[PDB]
């Protein structure tokens, strides 16, 4: 917006865990206002993570997002006759949004019985990085060096 007066609302309504990132992930996985459905699906996924993963699931969650967040992002700018791309450092707030969106959209595309164990599967895969979300993250990362020439 040209005016830049649009402030942001603050949401923090963690039911039991009392965290922050969890609720934003809730909103990301919430579809068509099905908040309770998102509750039960993500909590079943986290239960599977907790039974599979020895440690608590929240630090595993944040470590998984640590391996999906892209450090730099490429963005096309047209020089006026040619279609270029420019690498830029990602906004610190934007990193979490990209992390959450990528993780959800990649957990959606597994194809197994439900997306609770899909979310668990990519949560453990992203915990060190053998998933597909990390594949897209590293591809986008390497595009920056592929286009480091312009940068400025």
């Amino acid at each position: 917006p040209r005016r830049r007066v649009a402030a942001k609302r603050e949401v923090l309504a963690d039911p039991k865990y009392g965290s922050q990132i969890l609720a934003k992930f809730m909103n990301h996985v919430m579809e068509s206002g099905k908040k309770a459905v998102a509750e039960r699906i993500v909590y079943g996924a986290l239960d599977k993570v907790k039974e599979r993963g020895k440690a608590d699931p929240l630090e595993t969650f944040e470590k998984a997002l640590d391996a999906i967040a892209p450090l730099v992002e490429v963005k096309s700018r047209r020089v006026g006759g040619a279609t270029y791309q420019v690498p830029v450092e990602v906004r610190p707030s934007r990193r979490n949004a990209l992390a959450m969106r990528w993780l959800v959209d990649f957990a959606r595309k597994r194809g197994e019985k439900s997306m609770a164990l899909r979310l668990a599967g990519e949560l453990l895969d992203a915990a060190e990085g053998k998933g597909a979300a990390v594949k897209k993250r590293e591809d986008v990362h390497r595009m920056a060096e592929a286009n480091k020439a312009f940068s400025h």
Partner: protein, 119 residues
Amino acid sequence: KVKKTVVDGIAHIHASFNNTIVTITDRQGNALSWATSGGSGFRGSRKSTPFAAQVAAERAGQAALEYGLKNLDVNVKGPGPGRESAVRALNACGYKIASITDVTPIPHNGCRPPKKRRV
């Protein structure tokens, strides 16, 4: 298969509007190796950026390190971008800078330049 040693050579930059060419020779002006932004995989629009100039300069310096060359006298010629990129990039290979010179040929009156471009 022969090998020869040399110390305190000269590195040369040809920085035109489309390209930059970095070469290494001895004090007698005999080439040892050379690097060009074209051969590094840049091909035109990317060929002009100072980053490619830095890459070519550091590649040439690394190739020069085999013969030693503890000292380097550097000439730069041409108005292209990267006129200063190579100067900084050469130290990345660990070279002693002894003299930086600009040898751009300035015609006094000379021949006449080509016709103006109508764009």
